[PDB]
Structure formats: structure tokens, C-alpha cells
Write a protein that binds this ligand. Structure first.
Ligand SMILES: OC[C@H]1O[C@H](O[C@H]2[C@H](O)[C@@H](O)[C@@H](O)O[C@@H]2CO)[C@H](O)[C@@H](O)[C@@H]1O
Ligand SMILES: [Ca+2]
Length: 836
């Protein structure tokens, strides 16, 4: 499992994982950072599953073709090699790892299949696939076969199938892409028929896989196999006398292998992204690093110039490059896994007899066309999102303070706890993060299963089904309003509210929500949560003037719905009115809303007049007897002062102190009465001043001239001279501390952490360990600060083992930060109101 301060690496079991581990030993020897190499089964399928929760390795190795889908899913960090490092590698290897313009992985080596032949059995291997039956019959007379290779994977078989005219890919525009038109042409039919015939005529067996083919060739049973450079080591060991040469032709045309770049990507979930970078750039991608790996299992033609210059003298590498020259470079588009499913199913089915050759190819063609239309749909919607986001970001640059902190969907768990939950547990301390603006995106309803699981609302099963793939729920479903109906045509939901009444219809049946809520009337209707056929319907339905939402009961009052759909339902009276004084919508374009965050807001002012209390929305110049209703979100008010800034046009003309608040619990707020006298002005800002975090780090910090992690600036024990570049939007006298934050989960259901009945409750504990700087005088714009500082040993790890004590096997630690934090008296805008 991933941990701060060490590296986990995944690579396939056919590559040089033991040599890679030797690189990792050198790293640890120079660096103190332990590196673990693993080769899980089906790693290319496991990765997107586990990385979607925030698990998986720090670094994943695979051929470049899968990485686009990973990147599109947010699973990969953009890598940041400088031009000097890029120049060390062959320039066009970088194109394999570039996706929508960005570099998403490091290229390591170019791979292609070759024909490998036993020179004692077959000094003159056939050029042609056509020669293979007659050759096999002849060798069968002395107990040998002509050719064995992996028939289970289309990486190996498709080159035959596409040989007779056919590119599997097309340059479509800007990019190599999957070819849909003419997948089942006469050339492909001829290739796959040829293969099926080799099987039916008993020159090959449909069950032959990678292990069977390898053991056969390496024990001298078969004169030929097809494989990549990685296979050469086990051949050398077996002492077979072998050559590597050009793939056979079919119908006079080359067998065009797939050309893959073995590539190293950094998991977005990694808190070790700088370490991963150092390992890959300065340890792996060096002559010594690649040599260690290559000496375990050969890499092929490596991306690193200096080392490839040695390798290209080997005739086996020359043969590999000759096949790669004739091959098809794989796209890295997201539809690549669906392509491979299609083409994998086709060969298996045709080879096993499950389908005729033409039915096999027809269904592949239909799958590939379906995948392409989905890609075209997505790209249209990703453009839509692109531009809404772009307006919202432009608006933020133009209209918010320069060093303002903004977020959007370790911290992921805490965002999720805010978004997926309701009431007291959802009051997360965003001010700790110096959060200023929260962006919400209405379309994240489609991502709500992950958000709900990560925020502890639902179980692993509800999130994405159990082992078999059963039990997933739909957490949120939007229902646009068309007259007196709310409809989701896709999901076949119709809600009719005509005739002052509600009828819910899903497909053909009438369904009875557990509850319906109406906003803004606040009417509610309790129902059974079932459909008329007797099946469960565990959903709540909320209707608003413009939209409806169907929500799974466990997220029926999620704060996301409050913020994105304007549904104020809460299990805590008061909660929603409070929330909206802490999140103020200051802009909205497309389906993006930007909220101004303040931990301290006023959601109601009452004024006493003629002796009766009445809520007011503005205030005139003069005297008022007032009662302010305050929301504290996620942290307490402590030793605060309350002011009114009288405002004219955009200028503070007076500061008027109206109250002191020594304490207010964030879960138990109470009204404050004040009597005030206001001068003339266009408007009045209510402003709270108390201690809190200020400043934004500009570059990574340095300890003793060394570049360090802003989230883990010092290990426990360590000390040093520290230097920080800090931005502030105004001047401050600040203290500086080291502050640790622990984010962890606690299992609250299920028998163990692997049970699909498990849900996990996130928690964040923040504490200030040491004051390392007093009265530092920060000035508007940029600043350099330098102090000596030590993090005592025991601080981290002491807490870590107290968590153990309290939670045992329920505990899962997700992040531990040690951060430098400035603290000063800071202003919080609680509410601005007009004069008149
Ligand atoms: O067969 C489909 C499969 O082909 C490629 O995987 C190769 C891999 O690139 C090679 O490094 C080698 O290990 O053999 C694998 C095939 O068994 C694609 O890279 C992969 O996405 C795809 O599923
Ligand atoms: Ca509160």
C-alpha cells in the first residue's frame, strides 16, 4: 500500500522486475526511500479500479496504449521533465506518452514482436505464413511442431489478421485512432480463416497461451515462436540456439506488429510525486538503471539515446526494429481497452468455434463502431465542460484576490465528506486549508458514486458492485422539468405533478419514493420506498421549480444537492440557512457555480422596532437595535472581534467595532444582540477578525538549500534552515508553526476492510506542533522567510500509534502532512448588506 516517504511500483510479470528492484535498492541506498516492486496479475485492469478510489501503486509500467484512458479518468499526474531531460530521450518516443497535448508518462523502450526460430531445427525459417502447414506436417513426422505462440491475446494474432490489407489504426485527425470502416473486409476474413484453419488442421491448438508456447519453444519441441525482447532471457537460459527475424508474410504482405512503448506513469493518488520523478529521471532512465533492468529481461530499443547506442549493435535488436518499422504504432486514446475487448473476443470465438469467422468479425466491427460513437459523444461534452470551466477560471483571475485558494472535486476524502453528507459530520474545517472559493459542477452528479463512497455515505458494494458485479446503486439522477413533468428519458423516469398530486413512473411501473420534497413550499410526502410490483425503490425525490433529483436514501440530503440543485433539505433544522451564509454564489456559467467560502457568516439579521423583532435585508444610516444570526462552519469562533465596515463605492470609509465574541461552538451557534449607529454609506460589511491561517507558498520550500515537499516539509526528528516564498494579499504580523494534519478512515460496517459491506468514515485531525517563528512581518505581494526549525521525533508516529490503539484494524491512514503555516489576526467577510 502507498505511503508517504516510500515508493510502490507495478510492472508486468513478463518484464524485468528483479532488475527494476535492484534499481530501487540503489535508490534506497542513496536516498533512504524504500522501493517495492510488484507484478500483480491483470495489472492493466486492476490499476484503473484501485486508482479510482485513491489506491494502487505510486508508479505504473505498461505499454503506452492504456495510459490515455487512465489520464482521461484523472488517474495520472502530468509529468514535468525539463527540456534538458527530454533531449536525452529519442524525440518521437515522447509522442507515445503525450495525451491532449500533455506528457502523462515517461517512455522507457519501444517493443515489437519478432519471429524467433530454433536454428538446429530450422536453419532456414519460412518467410511466409502459407509455408507453415507443410512445414508443420514434416516436423510432426519427427515429433516437433512448426510454430507455437500465444493465441489468447490479439497483440499476437491480429498482425496476421490485418496482414492482407488492413491497418488496425488510421490517422484520423491529429492522431492515430481506431479504424472502424472495413474491420470485417475480405483481407481480415482471409487472415482469421487462415488462423482458424491452422487450428482445425491441428497445426496449432486453440488453448495455446503464453506459458505453453514459451515452455514448448524453450524445451526444443517447436521450431518457431512469436514473442518480444522480454522473452530472450529465458531462451538464453534454456540454451536453445535461436535467431530473431522478420514476421512471416501473408498473401505477400507483412505481418504488422503493434508497436508499444513501455512507459512509466505516476498515479495521481501518489503523495510521492517528486520522489517518483527523481527515481525515474535520475535512477531508472540512466545507462546503469536501464542496464540493470535489461539484464533481467530485455527492454527492446530503449528511449535513452546513450544506452540505445550500445544495444543497436545486437542483431536481435535490429530485427526487433525491422519489425517495428513495418508495424502499427498503437494509439493511446481511451477507447483502446474497448478495441482490445472487441478484437480479443473475435479471435477467441472464431478460434474456438463459438462463432464463424464472419460473425466474429461482424461483432468486432459493431463493438468498434459503438466505441467510436461514444468517443465522439464524450469529446463533444468534454468540449462543453472545457469552456464553462474556462470562463469560470477567467472570472476568478479577473475578480478575486491574487493569492486566493480555490477547489473543486487524502483531501479527496474530506471534500467527499462535505459533499456527500449532511449535518454535523459534514462540517469539515476548510479554513484549515485557507479555502477561499469552492467550484461546483452540476455534472458531477455522474461521479457521485465515488464521491459517496469516498465520503463514507455508502458501502463498497453500493459504490460499484460486489465480486460478481451486483449491488451497485445509482446515487443521483437529474430530472429536467418539462411543463408539469420531470423526466429522465434515458432512465425511463417520469414524474407527473399535474392535478396537484405526484405520480412516479420508472419504465412501465409505478414507484413510491421513501420521501418526496417540494421546494420552495417545503411540502413533504412520506412513502413506502417500493414499486407497485413489490420491488424496493430506495430513493428520495426532490422537486424544485427548474429541476428534480432522484437520490439514493443514503445521500438524500447531501450537501452537493443543496449547492448544485438548490435543494435545502437537511436532517438538522437551521443547517441549510446557515450553509448558505458560508457558501455564497458569486458566479455561474454553464453548469459551473463558484462559491465564495467563509467559515463565519451571518444568515439572518433581525431588527427590533416598535418593540417587535422583524428580519431585515438591508440597513439605513442611523441607530438600530439588532440581533445577528451567525453560522460557524467547521471551526469555532474564538477570541474574535466583530466590526461593521461602512462602505462607499468600493472603499472602506469607517471601521466600527460592534462586539466581542470570546467563543462560539461550530455546532451550537447562538444569536448576538448589538446596538449600532451607522454613518452614511452605500453598504455595510459585517467583518469578523480572529486568528487563522494566512499566506500561500509560491515555490516548494527548501530545508538546507534542499527542495522539499510543501505537504511534508520535515520528517520527525529532522531539523534545518528553512526558506519559504509566501504570497499575501495584504500586510500581516504572523507567527509561523509546523502543523500536522492526519486524514484517516474508520470502518463502520462489514467484518474487515475487504468486506463489500464496508463503509469508511473519514476524519481529519489538525494540530500545531511547534511555533518556529514569531512576529514575522509579511508585506503585500511576495516574501522570503527563513528560520531554523526542528520537528521533534515521536510527534508523528506517536499519534499514529494512538490511532491504532483507539481504532485497531478499522483504521486506514490516508494522509499525514507536516506543513509550515502562518497564523495572524485575519478578517472574515460574514455578510455585506446595502444601505437602503
Ligand atoms: O493483447 C492485447 C494487449 O496487447 C498489448 O499488451 C502487450 C504488451 O504491450 C506487451 O508489453 C506484452 O507484455 O504483451 C502484452 C500482451 O499480452 C497492449 O499493451 C495491451 O493494452 C493489450 O491489452
Ligand atoms: Ca455550524
Amino acid at each position: 500500500k502507498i505511503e508517504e516517504g516510500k515508493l510502490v511500483i507495478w510492472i508486468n510479470g513478463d518484464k524485468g522486475y528483479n532488475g527494476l528492484a535492484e534499481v530501487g535498492k540503489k535508490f534506497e541506498k542513496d536516498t533512504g526511500i524504500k522501493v517495492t516492486v510488484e507484478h500483480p496479475d491483470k495489472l492493466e485492469e486492476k490499476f484503473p479500479q484501485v486508482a479510482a478510489t485513491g489506491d494502487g501503486p505510486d508508479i505504473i509500467f505498461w505499454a503506452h496504449d492504456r495510459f490515455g484512458g487512465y489520464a482521461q479518468s484523472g488517474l495520472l499526474a502530468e509529468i514535468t521533465p525539463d527540456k534538458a531531460f527530454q533531449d536525452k530521450l529519442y524525440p518521437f518516443t515522447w509522442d507515445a506518452v503525450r495525451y491532449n497535448g500533455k506528457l502523462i508518462a515517461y517512455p522507457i523502450a519501444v517493443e515489437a514482436l519478432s519471429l524467433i526460430y530454433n536454428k538446429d531445427l530450422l536453419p532456414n525459417p519460412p518467410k511466409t505464413w502459407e509455408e507453415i502447414p507443410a512445414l508443420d506436417k514434416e516436423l510432426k513426422a519427427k515429433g516437433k511442431s512448426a510454430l507455437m505462440f500465444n493465441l489468447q491475446e490479439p497483440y499476437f494474432t491480429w498482425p496476421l489478421i490485418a496482414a492482407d490489407g488492413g491497418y488496425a489504426f488510421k490517422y484520423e485527425n491529429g492522431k492515430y485512432d481506431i479504424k472502424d470502416v472495413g474491420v470485417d473486409n475480405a483481407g481480415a476474413k482471409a487472415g482469421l480463416t487462415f488462423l482458424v484453419d491452422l487450428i482445425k488442421n491441428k497445426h496449432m491448438n486453440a488453448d495455446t497461451d503464453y506459458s505453453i508456447a514459451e515452455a514448448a519453444f524453450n524445451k526444443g519441441e517447436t521450431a518457431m515462436t512469436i514473442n518480444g525482447p522480454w522473452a530472450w532471457s529465458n531462451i538464453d537460459t534454456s540454451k536453445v540456439n535461436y535467431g530473431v527475424t522478420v514476421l512471416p508474410t501473408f498473401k505477400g504482405q507483412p505481418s504488422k506488429p503493434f508497436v508499444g512503448v513501455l512507459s512509466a506513469g505516476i498515479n495521481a493518488a501518489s503523495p510521492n510525486k517528486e520522489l517518483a520523478k527523481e527515481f525515474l529521471e535520475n535512477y531508472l532512465l540512466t545507462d546503469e538503471g536501464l542496464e540493470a533492468v535489461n539484464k533481467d529481461k530485455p527492454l527492446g530499443a530503449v528511449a535513452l539515446k546513450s544506452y540505445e547506442e550500445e544495444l543497436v549493435k545486437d542483431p536481435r535488436i535490429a530485427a526487433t526494429m525491422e519489425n517495428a518499422q513495418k508495424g502499427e504504432i498503437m494509439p493511446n486514446i481511451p477507447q483502446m481497452s474497448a478495441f482490445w475487448y472487441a478484437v480479443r473476443t473475435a479471435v477467441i470465438n472464431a478460434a474456438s468455434g463459438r462463432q464463424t469467422v464472419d460473425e466474429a468479425l461482424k461483432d468486432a466491427q459493431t463493438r468498434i463502431a459503438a466505441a467510436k460513437a461514444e468517443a465522439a459523444a464524450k469529446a463533444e461534452a468534454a468540449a462543453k465542460a472545457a469552456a464553462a470551466w474556462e470562463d469560470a477560471l477567467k472570472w476568478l483571475r479577473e475578480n478575486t484576490p491574487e493569492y486566493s485558494t480555490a477547489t473543486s472535486w487524502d483531501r479527496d476524502h474530506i471534500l467527499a465528506l462535505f459533499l456527500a453528507r449532511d449535518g454535523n459530520i459534514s462540517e469539515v474545517d476548510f479554513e484549515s486549508w485557507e479555502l477561499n472559493y469552492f467550484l461546483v459542477y452540476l455534472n458531477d452528479w455522474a461521479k457521485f458514486n465515488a464521491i459517496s463512497y469516498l465520503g463514507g455515505a455508502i458501502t463498497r458494494r453500493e459504490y460499484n458492485g460486489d465480486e460478481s458485479g451486483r449491488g451497485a446503486v445509482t446515487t443521483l439522477l437529474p430530472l429536467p422539468r418539462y411543463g408539469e413533468k420531470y423526466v429522465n428519458l434515458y432512465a425511463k423516469v417520469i414524474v407527473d405533478v399535474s392535478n396537484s398530486s405526484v405520480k412516479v413512473t420508472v419504465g412501465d411501473r409505478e414507484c413510491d419514493p421513501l420521501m418526496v420534497t417540494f421546494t420552495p413550499s417545503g411540502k413533504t410526502i412520506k412513502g413506502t420506498g417500493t414499486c407497485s410490483d413489490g420491488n424496493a425503490f430506495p430513493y428520495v425525490l426532490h422537486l424544485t421549480p427548474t429541476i428534480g433529483v432522484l437520490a439514493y436514501y443514503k445521500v438524500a440530503t447531501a450537501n452537493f444537492i443543496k449547492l448544485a440543485f438548490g435543494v435545502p433539505a437537511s436532517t438538522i433544522p437551521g443547517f441549510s440557512d446557515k450553509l448558505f451564509s458560508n457558501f455564497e454564489p458569486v458566479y455561474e456559467s454553464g453548469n459551473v457555480i463558484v462559491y465564495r467560502f467563509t467559515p463565519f457568516g451571518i444568515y439572518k439579521i433581525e431588527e427590533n422596532i416598535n418593540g417587535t423583532w422583524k428580519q431585515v435585508y438591508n440597513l439605513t444610516p442611523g441607530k438600530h437595535e439588532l440581533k445577528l444570526y451567525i453560522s460557524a462552519f467547521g471551526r469555532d469562533i474564538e477570541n474574535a472581534t466583530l466590526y461593521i465596515y461602512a462602505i462607499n463605492n468600493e472603499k472602506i470609509i469607517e471601521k466600527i467595532k460592534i462586539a466581542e465574541i470570546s467563543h462560539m461552538d461550530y455546532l451550537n451557534e447562538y444569536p448576538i444582540a448589538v446596538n449600532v449607529t451607522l454613518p452614511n454609506a452605500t453598504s455595510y460589511r459585517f467583518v469578523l477578525v480572529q486568528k487563522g491561517p494566512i499566506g500561500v507558498l509560491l515555490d516548494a520550500p527548501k530545508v538546507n538549500g534542499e527542495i522539499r515537499s510543501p505537504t511534508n516539509i520535515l520528517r520527525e526528528g529532522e531539523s534545518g534552515e528553512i526558506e519559504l516564498k509566501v504570497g499575501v494579499d495584504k500586510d500581516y504580523t504572523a507567527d509561523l508553526y509546523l502543523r500536522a494534519t492526519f486524514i484517516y478512515l474508520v470502518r463502520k460496517s462489514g467484518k474487515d476492510n475487504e468486506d463489500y459491506d464496508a463503509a469508511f468514515e473519514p476524519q481529519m485531525d489538525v494540530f500545531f506542533i511547534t511555533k518556529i517563528g514569531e512576529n514575522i512581518q509579511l508585506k503585500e505581494g511576495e516574501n522570503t522567510v527563513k528560520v531554523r526549525a526542528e520537528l521533534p521525533e515521536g510527534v508523528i508516529s506517536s499519534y499514529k500509534d494512538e490511532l491504532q490503539r483507539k481504532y485497531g484494524d478499522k483504521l486506514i491512514i490516508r494522509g499525514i502532512r507536516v506543513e509550515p503555516v502562518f497564523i495572524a489576526e485575519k478578517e472574515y467577510l460574514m455578510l455585506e448588506v446595502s444601505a437602503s
